[PDB]
Design a protein around this nucleic acid. Structure first.
Ligand SMILES: [Mn+2]
Ligand SMILES: [Mn+2]
Ligand SMILES: [Mn+2]
Ligand SMILES: [Mn+2]
Ligand SMILES: [Mn+2]
Ligand SMILES: [Mn+2]
Ligand SMILES: [Mn+2]
Lengths: 97, 82, 106, 99, 105, 94, 85, 99
DNA sequence: ATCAATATCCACGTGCCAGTTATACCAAAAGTGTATTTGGAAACTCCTAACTGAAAAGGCATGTTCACGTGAATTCACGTGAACATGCCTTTTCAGTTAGGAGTTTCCAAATACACTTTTGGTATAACTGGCACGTGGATATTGAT
DNA sequence: ATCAATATCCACGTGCCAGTTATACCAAAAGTGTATTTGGAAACTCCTAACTGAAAAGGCATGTTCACGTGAATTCACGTGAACATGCCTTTTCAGTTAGGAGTTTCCAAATACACTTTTGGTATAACTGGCACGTGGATATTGAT
């Protein structure tokens, strides 16, 4: 019998590391930290967006719920740059169809 | 009289709050330090409350907006909705 | 010639996987198409910000491989990442070297 | 002829008066004037439900009174009776609101 | 032809708790027992606070509970105070407490 | 043409059962309504996470029970679990 | 089969507590600090282990997992990175 | 003739040493016993993933180091350099861990 | 001690408004009974990893000695908050305009739902090597005695 | 200041193992396409309740006087740090054992999905009164001066 597949973000974290420090690697314990960080930030944003939709009696979480959650959770400059990256990713995703 | 609104939170009012907090003697520098704290607290809460308002496409900050903001800051408030 | 939603969005983070976790996590009844895209971009961004600051700390310590100590120095020395992760513990990360001035001699 | 209570006697009377009561201790109009000013830096032409401002005032006064308790403990820990800015600063640091 | 609250023996709306669970995005499915259990827990805790708050009103020689009596009831009970340690009761005030070193003589 | 729910009706019912000759002001009722909604979201939120942790789709009364043990302090948890098992028993046989 | 466990809070040695104060930037340590720290640590460990085992029981498991500890730490506001999701 | 560093020199050297490093400062096996003693007096016949015990030790040492930082500020605030139990108690009271 | 000024109870009278009581619609739940679907408890068996135990060594814990700097106690000077009476302007309490919250309604873009196809991520084995950890000696910095 | 003891920094070479790399296998997601459903943006209108304005109410600003709390200075007993001898128990690496975690499959109690019935809780309007806020006198306690 085969042990089930344990997903992680390690493949994606490693790519980002290569765009940012092409000559730098990462230890498994450091990779473990990063997987905790991404899952933590995911659930924070998705959780805040969930309450946004409910507070306004909306059954759908959109890019607009995610953006407001990013503004609520991230501090100043981090939110400014995160908003631009998200707004940019969505417009690119829309027109590319 | 042209004076700031943060000075509208007056010295005897700050003195009253310290009394409810059980304070017997108040240094003069406390009053400027307190207003700085109060301003920071309100900015953090009003920023989040206004963010809820903008998302609801409204121009009226509701008491629920304030309640949702306080809860996010770990300052859960009872008696103004929900 | 199909293409993943990640590439279509310009992302290195998996939009499709993020979409699955939004539905599987019981956050709402329905998920817009833009939500996983936007959220995957934010996650990819923050990952880049930490890895840049950590990669520098690893360079300052004459190491080529990021370790938890580097992620700790990176986070604690950046005021906005510190605030974001102020209630977080990084296993094997340690603390920032800091000595109260009154404790030094002379 | 005039009567004078010794310093600290009235202050202990004030503590007992204000710990017994529950009324808001900041004046409404300066406070409401402060709320609209702070929000103006975040969004323009804003209106406030009257209960929204009251909610803010109850939360703010509760926050400040609670901080004065911790501040008072810091002063007393330093073998003092007077709260000083370093007392407030120490309480806010240990609370994790700063540094 | 009876309501689930009566069938469970509860003053609290079992049927309403069930609706709030499904519409709250807590899980895909809600068992038939969960809204009963949850309604019973909520009813118990309301009774606990209202009991202690009723005493506080009687001790102020008052017949009608006001927020002050709810504040006095909670901050004086060790466990409700723990359960509501990070909660602010509007128009509740604070418990009378003067540090000993601040008294004269 | 607008309606708003609350717990005031059931709160007042519980008040008469514990203090028959006692009233409750409106402000006190708003605080009691906030209390119930708070404890509701805490218990349901914890139960949701319990289900997700164990790859389950159903919030059963066992989830509500473990959430109660996790959220209430010592003795309050004991009596709440008791009153909870009491209501589900009486509901099952009737 | 296994030997009775008792008084293990004294395995938190006086040098070990000193080392922890050092990482915390402490220069001089009063003699009473050591038993106060054991009491504080014991309370902290109990609360976490209590929640952890409750997660273990609810999963009808006999083994406390790292995820059990991580979930327990999370709900006490001590989020931990590096031991699973 | 025999060399002696003055009281404080080695302590500051140790501060620099341990703030520089990341390893766990409590011995592994004594800590594992403590976990097993506590857990077993709450529920019998329990086993532990080794990672679960390391997770607990990382949490405790992180918690204690942080508490010692806050403790050190309380002592310095009282014009001492020696942490005392009342410093720890004040730190935990302001943190709300005891209040 | 004897006083007197002021604060604080106490027992009682007063009017008013927020609370209690009741009633009538009534839509929106909540319930009932049916058909229908499914999660996850139950079997079983595979296999991971937790536990046990040996055994050696050396990294630390322990306990002791000794000096000295730290915290605590005490005294003293002076300056800063507390107390207070004053002069009055700011907040508080009322009125009649509308901004916009919130309901209702339509209908299209956008979501879910199915089946089917493609590929991408994770596991695993073998393989590999360069990064780091360790040990050394050797030149440099720091500390304490003088 | 000079000096010596000691710690510290850094470059050096070492073996080793975790990280990197590359093979194939493959199931499980993900992507694509179709028909189906629907949430909620958009008009518009309604109707609170937030804003403005003006006129009254009482809290705040001001300056003076001095009680006394704070910080500075000085002493000193002794608790705490540094150093050291001793050896114990943690740590380390290997082995074998089986508990219990986890994977698979079956199948039934309990879930959802309707449609339909029934009633409950919210609203509203009118009514109602007693609980509570507030003012009173006058007896006592408190406080500070003497
Ligand atoms: Mn035991
Ligand atoms: Mn000293
Ligand atoms: Mn308009
Ligand atoms: Mn691949
Ligand atoms: Mn020994
Ligand atoms: Mn078995
Ligand atoms: Mn009814």
């Amino acid at each position: 019998r085969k042990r089930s597949r344990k997903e992680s973000y390690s493949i994606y974290v490693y790519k980002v590391l290569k765009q940012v420090h092409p000559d730098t690697g990462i230890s498994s314990k450091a990779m473990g930290i990063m997987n905790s960080f991404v899952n933590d930030i995911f659930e924070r944003i998705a959780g805040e967006a969930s309450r946004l939709a409910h507070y306004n009696k909306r059954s759908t979480i959109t890019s607009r719920e995610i953006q407001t959650a990013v503004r609520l959770l991230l501090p100043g400059e981090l939110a400014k740059h995160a908003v631009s990256e998200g707004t940019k990713a969505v417009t690119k995703y829309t027109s590319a169809k | 009289v042209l004076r700031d609104n943060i000075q509208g939170i007056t010295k005897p009012a700050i003195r009253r709050l310290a009394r409810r907090g059980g304070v017997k003697r108040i240094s003069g520098l406390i009053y400027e330090e307190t207003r700085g704290v109060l301003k920071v607290f309100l900015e953090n809460v009003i920023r989040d409350a206004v963010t809820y308002t903008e998302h609801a496409k409204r121009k009226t900050v509701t008491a629920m907006d304030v309640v949702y903001a306080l809860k996010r800051q770990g300052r859960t408030l009872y008696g103004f909705g929900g | 010639k199909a293409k993943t939603r990640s590439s279509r969005a310009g992302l290195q983070f998996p939009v499709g996987r993020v979409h699955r976790l939004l539905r599987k996590g019981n956050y709402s009844e329905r998920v817009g198409a833009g939500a996983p895209v936007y959220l995957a971009a934010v996650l990819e961004y923050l990952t880049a910000e930490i890895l840049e600051l950590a990669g520098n700390a690893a360079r300052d310590n004459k190491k080529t491989r990021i370790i938890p100590r580097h992620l700790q120095l990176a986070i604690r020395n950046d005021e906005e990442l510190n605030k974001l992760l102020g209630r977080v513990t990084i296993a094997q990360g340690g603390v920032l070297p800091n000595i109260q001035a009154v404790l030094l001699p002379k | 002829k005039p009567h004078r209570y010794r310093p600290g006697t009235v202050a202990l009377r004030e503590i007992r008066r204000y710990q017994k009561s529950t009324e808001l201790l900041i004046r409404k109009l300066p406070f409401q004037r402060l709320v609209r000013e702070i929000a103006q830096d975040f969004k323009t032409d804003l209106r406030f439900q009257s209960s929204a401002v009251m909610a803010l005032q109850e939360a703010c006064e509760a926050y400040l009174v609670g901080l004065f308790e911790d501040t008072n403990l810091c002063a007393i820990h330093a073998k003092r009776v007077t709260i000083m800015p370093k007392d407030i600063q120490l309480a806010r640091r240990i609370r994790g609101e700063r540094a």
